Design a protein around this ligand. Structure first.
Ligand SMILES: CN(C)c1sc(C#N)c2c1-c1nc(Nc3cccc(O)c3)ncc1CC2
Length: 330
């Protein structure tokens, strides 16, 4: 029958994966029937060989998700690519099929405080495991939080993930305009969005993003501004007129006072004064779900065998070909 196709684009995943149907982009992402495990799966087509940045982003995700094994993190079941390096133009990552994402859910559904509390717990449960491995997600947002029929949550897209030592603007920490705290900020933005079904900081650009943050948190203090900050960004925020702090209960008068207290501690301008993943799970708002016994952590910190940023384009393609060879027949 030949290689399969979806919306005028090759999707050569057959004969194992058949009956394809489009979902979205991230390249193209489809659902497919697996003839071996007799279930429908998710398949992400990646075409990254034009740019060295897309190759290292693809390699980092594969290496991280193959090492990671946690209920609140999407794994990798299979990887399809050409039998020879010359013909390898694409990489197909096969993962578990989820019903929806948090972006599509919040666009059509109102969440009860109980559902908000359970989603937040699972995000922080999964983040606890990520952070214990000394890994930063760097792009936590509603579209990266997959959900199943029974409301179970999984974190996906580890392309922008780096080892602890570019992102979606709305959920991007002020310090970026680096460390584990940037992911807490992003979870803060996700919590605020779950409470009102709209983004708390919808900036059109980097400047508008900062103005939206200051519009709620108020003008930053001397200690907030004092850091290894961008000279242009510092002078801009100093030139801006005074902005008053909007109390959290004024933005979400409906919301649980415990949910707001946690949101305040997560949406802290200063990343050093910001709440960490453990103290966040231990917060009185999440006591119904907090269980240190059933919250696994990584065995050892994650580390790359080599500096991927220094490797030339050709060696990077060979590494992708080598890392994916384990899923080849042989
Ligand atoms: C949102 N989306 C298309 C993306 S980007 C993406 C990445 N990285 C994934 C998925 C995905 N999605 C789904 N399911 C899903 C998501 C949205 C709508 C829908 O009907 C199903 N299951 C597994 C996955 C696998 C991982």
């Amino acid at each position: 029958a030949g290689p399969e196709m979806v919306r005028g684009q090759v999707f050569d995943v057959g004969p194992r994966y058949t009956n394809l149907s489009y979902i979205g982009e991230g390249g193209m992402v489809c659902s497919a029937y697996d003839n071996v495990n007799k279930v429908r799966v998710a398949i992400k087509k990646i075409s990254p060989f034009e740019h060295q940045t897309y190759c290292q982003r693809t390699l980092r995700e594969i290496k991280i998700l193959l090492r990671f094994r946690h209920e609140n993190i999407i794994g990798i079941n299979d990887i399809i690519r050409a039998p020879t390096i010359e013909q390898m133009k694409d990489v197909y990552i096969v993962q578990d099929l989820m019903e929806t994402d948090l972006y599509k859910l919040l666009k059509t559904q109102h969440l009860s405080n109980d559902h908000i509390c359970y989603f937040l717990y699972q995000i922080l449960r999964g983040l606890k495991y990520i952070h214990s491995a000394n890994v930063l997600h760097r792009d936590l947002k509603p579209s990266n939080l997959l959900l199943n029929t029974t409301c179970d949550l999984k974190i996906c897209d580890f392309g922008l993930a780096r080892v602890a030592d570019v992102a979606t603007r709305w959920y991007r920490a002020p310090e970026i305009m680096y460390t584990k705290s940037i992911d807490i900020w992003s979870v803060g933005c996700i919590l605020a969005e779950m409470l009102s079904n709209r983004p708390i900081f919808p900036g059109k650009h980097y400047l508008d993003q900062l103005n939206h943050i200051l519009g709620i948190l108020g003008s930053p203090s001397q200690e907030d501004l004092n850091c290894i900050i961008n000279l242009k960004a510092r002078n801009y925020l100093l030139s801006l007129p005074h902005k008053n702090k909007v109390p959290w209960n004024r933005l979400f008068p409906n919301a649980d006072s415990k949910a707001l207290d946690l949101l305040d501690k997560m949406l802290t301008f200063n990343p050093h004064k910001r709440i960490e993943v453990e103290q966040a799970l231990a917060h009185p708002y999440l006591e119904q779900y907090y269980d240190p016994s059933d919250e696994p952590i990584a065995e050892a910190p994650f580390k790359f065998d080599m500096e991927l940023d220094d490797l030339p384009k050709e060696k990077l393609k060979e590494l992708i070909f080598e890392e994916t060879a384990r899923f080849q027949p042989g």
